[model samples]
Target: GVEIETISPGDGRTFPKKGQTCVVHYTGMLQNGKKFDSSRDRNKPFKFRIGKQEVIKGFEEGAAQMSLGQRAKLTCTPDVAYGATGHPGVIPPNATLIFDVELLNLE
Candidate 1:
């Protein structure tokens, strides 16, 4: 569902447990590195529950793999991302997505 590349593993050693809410700051980009969305730009942290469909499949999956304060780059394939139809007016059809994600907290 996702490909993860660690940037900095952060100080924390524990992953977010299933059903726990995860807070993060992230940038979403396309294959060409064009940014589509960003929590940092909004100056807000995104929060989602693990295994709860609060976010997309790939993003949630990637988040589950991260420890608190961890930074990682995730390559999310279309199937686990927006799929063929994609998000209208944002992600294009069949787009592969990238996310620079930081796991700020697990609440």
Candidate 2:
């Protein structure tokens, strides 16, 4: 088993080291807390690695600072998440995102 330490907020976290992969369970919502996606409800979590570009930019950045077994609530602006154009028509330009995340494990 792996032991993880808690990380302070707004510290500009470091991402998965080198070739490590991160596994997480998450719930995503708007500023009003209306949920959009949830790994808990889906019964399957999401996983990815550093520098992989497999998910959104904001998600990658926010998760970087987290240690294994840590959880956090993150708020992201569209510019840092989906950029100014905002998902090329999926997400709107003015969207503010909220994510409740648990960094389950890293390998």
Candidate 3:
């Protein structure tokens, strides 16, 4: 499961739908507050198609719920994330992830 907490509201009335191409900037952190990855660190927005398995389930689901320019935190339980196997070296077994994401565009 994913828990979404809005940091800032977006102006758009529409939420992104499945099969839409979305662009975002994000910071992924562990429960201890250590960052695992970030789009802002790389200075590039990430793009992916919704519901396409292009990313983790929680990440994709969170994106789909966002309106354009929305900033929010998505706290993802392991079942909706990497599960028992986790992400090899990047994530530990059964680790929960916290993501601060800003949906930039639905292109």
Candidate 1 vs. true structure, TM-score: 0.90
Please give the lDDT score for candidate 1. 0.83
**Candidate 1 residue pairs in backbone clash:** none
Model 1 lDDT per residue over 1-107, tens place: 67888778587577888888778899988998599999999988887778767788878888878887789898988887667777879987788889889898767
**Arranged by lDDT, best first:** 1, 3, 2
Q: How many backbone clashes does candidate 3 have?
A: 0
Best by lDDT: 1
Q: In candidate 2, what are the lDDT values of residues 14-82, reduced to their tens digit?
A: 446645777878888887648877888897787677787777766777677676666777777667665
Estimate TM-scores for all models. Answer: 0.90, 0.74, 0.90
User: How far off is residue 38 in model 2, in Å?
Assistant: 1.4
Show pairs that collide, candidate 3: none
Alpha-carbon runs more than 4 Å astray in model 2: 1-15, 87-90
